[PDB]
Structures are given as structure tokens and as C-alpha cells.
Design a protein around this ligand. Structure first.
Ligand SMILES: Nc1nc2c(ncn2[C@@H]2O[C@H](COP(=O)(O)OP(=O)(O)NP(=O)(O)O)[C@@H](O)[C@H]2O)c(=O)[nH]1
Ligand SMILES: [Mg+2]
Length: 155
């Protein structure tokens, strides 16, 4: 079977761990336990293909096959600093064509300081898809992770 190595990156507190745990455990973590380094695995079916998701949850290397670049829509600075994570990845992989998805998390909150059109423009300049998610309501979570898997497939 095929295994997909996915790496979730982004600033602190944007919800990387809540996202990974919502996908894997179908459970929203209310608390904020800072991550130093964590790894999760789960067999899922994607487009009729049984595959193993291996997800590295990082704190706010070269083995990552795809990357979720996460900011929070109510955290302007986390969006302003996403370019640092993209460029870090681009450095390590030594490729301008790295499977990647731009994720705007916490889309259930009404305190939105990052406009969707702004994130769409950024994603477009990166040549990657933009997906808004909520680890709480599960909106867009499957969309984000599975879209990243499909981006790995096209590569
Ligand atoms: N309402 C809402 N709250 C969220 C969402 N995602 C995360 N949170 C909340 O925001 C906080 C941050 O969660 P967390 O996932 O740990 O962030 P993180 O990016 O992994 N932090 P670190 O880099 O420190 O490991 C938590 O209290 C969590 O409950 C979301 O989609 N909606
Ligand atoms: Mg975390």
C-alpha cells in the first residue's frame, strides 16, 4: 500500500495539533498543550485507495512528502509569518514544486482579521490551493488533508 508523509507547520497556537487530532481522533481538543514534537498514524480510504497517513505535528525534516502550512484567520501575525515556513521547506527540499496546501484554521470564529481574498492571493502566488478549516466543527479538515494527499499524487 501507499503511505503519505504529511507535515503540519505554522505559527504557535494556530491549531496544528487540533487539526491533526480532529482528523485522526474525530475529537476537538479544547486545551492548548504546546507541541514540541509529535507523530500520528492512521489508515484511511482516499478515493477508493486504502493508504496510511503518517502525520508529523511540529512545534510552532527532509522526509516530508507534503506540507500543510497553517495560519489562523483570527491571528494576523500567523498569516504574515507563513512565508517563513514556506521558504524553510523550499530550502530543505531544494525544490520549487513541493506538495503544499495553505490552511486558514479557526474559521468558526467571528474575529476574522485575515480576509479570505488575501489568503487566496498568497496561495495563488505560491501555486498551491487554499482551504479554510475549523478543528472544532470539522469544516474543511478532510478537505485540507485529502487535498494535500492528492497534491502528492499529482507530483
Ligand atoms: N475555535 C477553534 N479553536 C481552535 C481551533 N483550532 C484550535 N483551536 C484552539 O486554539 C488553541 C490552539 O490549539 P493547538 O492546536 O494546540 O495549536 P498549535 O498550533 O498546535 N500550537 P503549538 O505550535 O504550540 O503546538 C487551542 O486552545 C484550541 O482549542 C479551531 O479550529 N477553532
Ligand atoms: Mg501543537
Amino acid at each position: 500500500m501507499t503511505e503519505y508523509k504529511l507535515v503540519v507547520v505554522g505559527a504557535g497556537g494556530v491549531g496544528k495539533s487540533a487539526l491533526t487530532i480532529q482528523l485522526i481522533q474525530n475529537h476537538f481538543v479544547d486545551e492548548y498543550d504546546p507541541t514540541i514534537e509529535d507523530s500520528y498514524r492512521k489508515q484511511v480510504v482516499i478515493d477508493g485507495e486504502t493508504c496510511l497517513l503518517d502525520i508529523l505535528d511540529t512545534a510552532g525534516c527532509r522526509t516530508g512528502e507534503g506540507f500543510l502550512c497553517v495560519f489562523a484567520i483570527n491571528n494576523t501575525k500567523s498569516f504574515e509569518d507563513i512565508h517563513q515556513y514556506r521558504e524553510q521547506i523550499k530550502r530543505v527540499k531544494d525544490s520549487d514544486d513541493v506538495p503544499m496546501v495553505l490552511v486558514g484554521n479557526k474559521c468558526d470564529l467571528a474575529a476574522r482579521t485575515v480576509e479570505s481574498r488575501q489568503a487566496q492571493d498568497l496561495a495563488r502566488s505560491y501555486g498551491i490551493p487554499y482551504i479554510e478549516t475549523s478543528a472544532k466543527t470539522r469544516q474543511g479538515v478532510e478537505d485540507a488533508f485529502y487535498t494535500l494527499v492528492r497534491e502528492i499524487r499529482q507530483h
